[PDB]
Design a protein around this ligand. Structure first.
Ligand SMILES: O=c1[nH]cnc2c([C@@H]3N[C@H](CO)[C@@H](O)[C@H]3O)c[nH]c12
Ligand SMILES: O=c1[nH]cnc2c([C@@H]3N[C@H](CO)[C@@H](O)[C@H]3O)c[nH]c12
Ligand SMILES: [Ca+2]
Ligand SMILES: [Ca+2]
Lengths: 316, 316
């Protein structure tokens, strides 16, 4: 049983990924650590607790994280994507279970130090809690097994601006800190996830299946599909967070390229992820020379990832 | 007949492109406007005059442009690529012809205003002179026939930094000004030019040909080839500027995608070209929404571009 901590802003696709993790054999969810992005951190915390309740996992701790990015200020949330409270149009009563007292930072630090070399972190939102855990404990990057990040856009369009993917754009300083931290990092960007199309047809099939959470997953994905159809002009949704979950437990369905990743933290291209490709020898030193390289998901076996997500969500 | 002005930093591949333009039927070179990049502006001016002499085009004016980018300061020149002199360490006698008195800015403004809708500008270097022409005259963007730009890297690695192509990196403010100006612009980036490989075998065939400028072009390309062999680890050169010349006179050999292009002018990603693909409706305004889209070369018929360059340089 592989120990994982999911740092998340649920969030419609995060909810799919969280329920997939609870349904995944050989995986133990130590806890959910929450962050803003798709919704406010308080809405993310409420949705994480609703998910734990829904999955009969009342014992899985939910530790609330940062309410603001590292630079401070009230975050702009993707409510036009994930609904006013982050759960699309799904009307569910408030959870009875409560968050634990410890912050996401402290929860991350404690579990990694308690089980050194055993815990994998799946980062589904902005990287604020992860950068904060790094700031707090210098042994965190050495003791964390790996960090699988859903974020960035490597030689692909961003979704927050033409240049930036949302999770990175939501906290550029945190992302740059994490990517240069020297931890064993695997980054899954929009270059990968926009290749994995899920259709209106796939959702209707799911609605008509025996999947444990099929009804809820279709109800929650409805707002998500309506927004994608409106914004992209196609009845296709991208399940970014489930795709990164596949990179975490089925990394053989992807190929990874190693290289230094830096994040633009200022200007019009704020949130942009730039990777040094190692194909050209630099005549002069630059912001990418001297850092530890990380792994960036480069290719993806799309039918196999689709089949893997479907297997987990259709499971009775 | 087609009237063109070539803005250039010759430069080894610029020299190939300039001699190709002089060898191109139905093309009239109104003049060469010089800029820094591959070498200092004074070295670029000397090389442009040497090229006009070599080509028996003593009547073609050479107008010297800016010595610094728009933001000021001394530019870093690509002498490791184009030699200390900008011609691959080939010593040539000083030209007898002299530059005209007018600056590149004034030359560009005068010819465009004198022949409205007739003049095409081929931009082979940093875009400083073109930005200065737009700043001086608001009718420039309306009266220039088109601007064909060799610059940027669209969803591809840069060659100045992992994030930026050299011409843009050399003057980011000028590039951002040109790209948002509303002129009819066509941009050919590294995403295109790195697809058009020329080898040590192609250079030996050129030396075996009766090409008018074969001796000179093989002499200057030895430095260019040695640097590519050293930096890229392959006996392959990229003739970026000749490829943009092919986009100018044979645009049917490429496909173009329309989109708004902005340039990062600060931070680690300075010089980065980010294109809004226009496939996603933005929920909020951003630095890419209030501008006229430009055309970005998307695909290229590589054998046809190679054959076109070879035909022009092997021509006795
Ligand atoms: O279009 C979008 N804009 C902003 N965020 C998202 C997301 C969320 N942000 C991440 C992908 O940008 C992912 O974790 C997902 O939960 C999906 N689509 C969009
Ligand atoms: O590797 C390079 N670094 C910087 N500039 C160039 C160039 C010049 N700069 C442009 C392409 O980056 C093009 O106009 C060419 O003349 C070729 N190769 C390199
Ligand atoms: Ca998320
Ligand atoms: Ca050039």
């Amino acid at each position: 049983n592989s120990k994982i901590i999911i740092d998340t802003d649920p969030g419609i696709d995060d909810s799919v990924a969280i329920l997939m993790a609870f349904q995944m054999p050989g995986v133990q969810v130590l806890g959910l650590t929450t962050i803003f992005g798709n919704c406010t951190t308080e809405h993310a915390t409420r949705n994480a607790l609703i998910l734990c309740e829904k999955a009969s996992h009342l014992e899985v701790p939910v530790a609330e994280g940062s309410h603001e990015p590292l630079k401070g200020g009230k975050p702009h949330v993707a409510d036009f994507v994930h609904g006013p409270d982050g759960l699309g149009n799904v009307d569910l009563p408030d959870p009875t279970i409560k968050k634990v007292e410890e912050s996401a930072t402290d929860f991350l630090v404690d579990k990694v130090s308690r089980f050194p070399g055993e815990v994998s972190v799946l980062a589904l939102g902005p990287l604020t809690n992860i950068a904060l855990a790094i700031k707090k404990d210098p042994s965190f990057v050495k003791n964390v097994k790996k960090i699988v990040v859903l974020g960035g856009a490597f030689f692909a369009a961003g979704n927050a601006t033409p240049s930036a993917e949302a999770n990175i754009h939501s906290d550029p300083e945190a992302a740059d800190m994490v990517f240069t931290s020297g931890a064993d990092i695997y980054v899954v960007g929009l270059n990968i996830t926009t290749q994995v199309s899920f259709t209106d047809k796939d959702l209707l099939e799911l609605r008509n299946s025996q999947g444990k959470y099929a009804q809820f997953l279709c109800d929650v994905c409805k707002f998500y599909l309506d927004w994608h159809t409106e914004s992209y002009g196609a009845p296709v949704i991208f399940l970014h967070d489930p795709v990164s979950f596949a990179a975490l437990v089925r990394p053989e369905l992807f190929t990874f390229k190693k290289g230094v990743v830096r994040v633009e933290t200022q200007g019009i291209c704020v949130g942009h992820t730039s990777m040094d490709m190692l194909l050209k020898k630099w005549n002069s030193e630059n912001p990418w020379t001297g850092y530890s390289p990380i792994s960036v998901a480069w290719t993806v076996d799309v039918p196999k990832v689709v089949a893997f997500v479907k297997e987990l969500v259709t499971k009775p």
